[PDB]
Amino acid sequence: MVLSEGEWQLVLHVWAKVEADVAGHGQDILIRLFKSHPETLEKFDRFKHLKTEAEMKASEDLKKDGVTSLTALGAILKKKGHHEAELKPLAQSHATKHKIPIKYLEFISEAIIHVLHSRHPGNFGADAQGAMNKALELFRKDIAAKYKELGYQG
Numbered sequence: 588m589v590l591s592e593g594e595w596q597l598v599l600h601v602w603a604k605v606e607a608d609v610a611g612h613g614q615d616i617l618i619r620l621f622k623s624h625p626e627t628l629e630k631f632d633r634f635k636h637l638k639t640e641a642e643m644k645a646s647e648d649l650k651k652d653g654v655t656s657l658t659a660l661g662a663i664l665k666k667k668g669h670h671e672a673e674l675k676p677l678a679q680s681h682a683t684k685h686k687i688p689i690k691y692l693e694f695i696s697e698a699i700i701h702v703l704h705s706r707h708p709g710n711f712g713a714d715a716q717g718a719m720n721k722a723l724e725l726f727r728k729d730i731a732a733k734y735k736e737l738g739y740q741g
């Protein structure tokens with residue numbers, strides 16, 4: 588699959604807004620993921636014990652991982668499809684060390700769309716959401732392929 592320049596522009600335009608507050612969006616997204624799919628929290632040994640949203644909001648560790656996650660995703664998106672080099676180390680750690688199934692990447696993709704929809708309505712209309720979904724699907728398809736090559740695929 589390939590995105591058009593117009594689609595990449597819609598993706599990068601809303602991402603430019605996200606970058607005004609990376610830490611804030613990172614928290615919203617991970618917390619959304621953890622509330623909608625509690626099982627995903629188990630993968631984070633550092634804060635698997637957090638019991639409430641209040642505790643999650645106060646966690647500096649959770650915030651730091653949110654920033655690291657979004658910054659890595661942002662670098663991938665800015666490559667507009669030419670992300671082979673960026674995906675290699677990411678696919679290896681998540682497949683071999685963290686053991687993150689593709690299903691969880693779908694869950695976080697859902698959390699990303701939900702948060703952008705809530706915080707950037709004016710820059711996240713139907714066309715913009717469609718483009719973002721397409722970019723995340725491309726990301727998931729390529730990462731899944733690397734998982735297979737790495738002997739994980741799952």
Ligand code: HEM
Nearest residue numbers: 627630631655656659660676677680681685687691692695
């Ligand atoms: C948008 C997709 C994601 C991106 C871009 C991303 C990016 C990253 C980055 C850059 C790191 C640090 C370097 C590394 O270990 O590779 C990391 C660590 C990690 N990621 Fe992800 N990640 C994503 C999704 C997920 C999901 C869905 C989970 C689990 C539900 C997850 C679990 C972890 C864990 C457990 C670590 C290690 C944290 C630690 O112990 O310090 N990641 N991720």
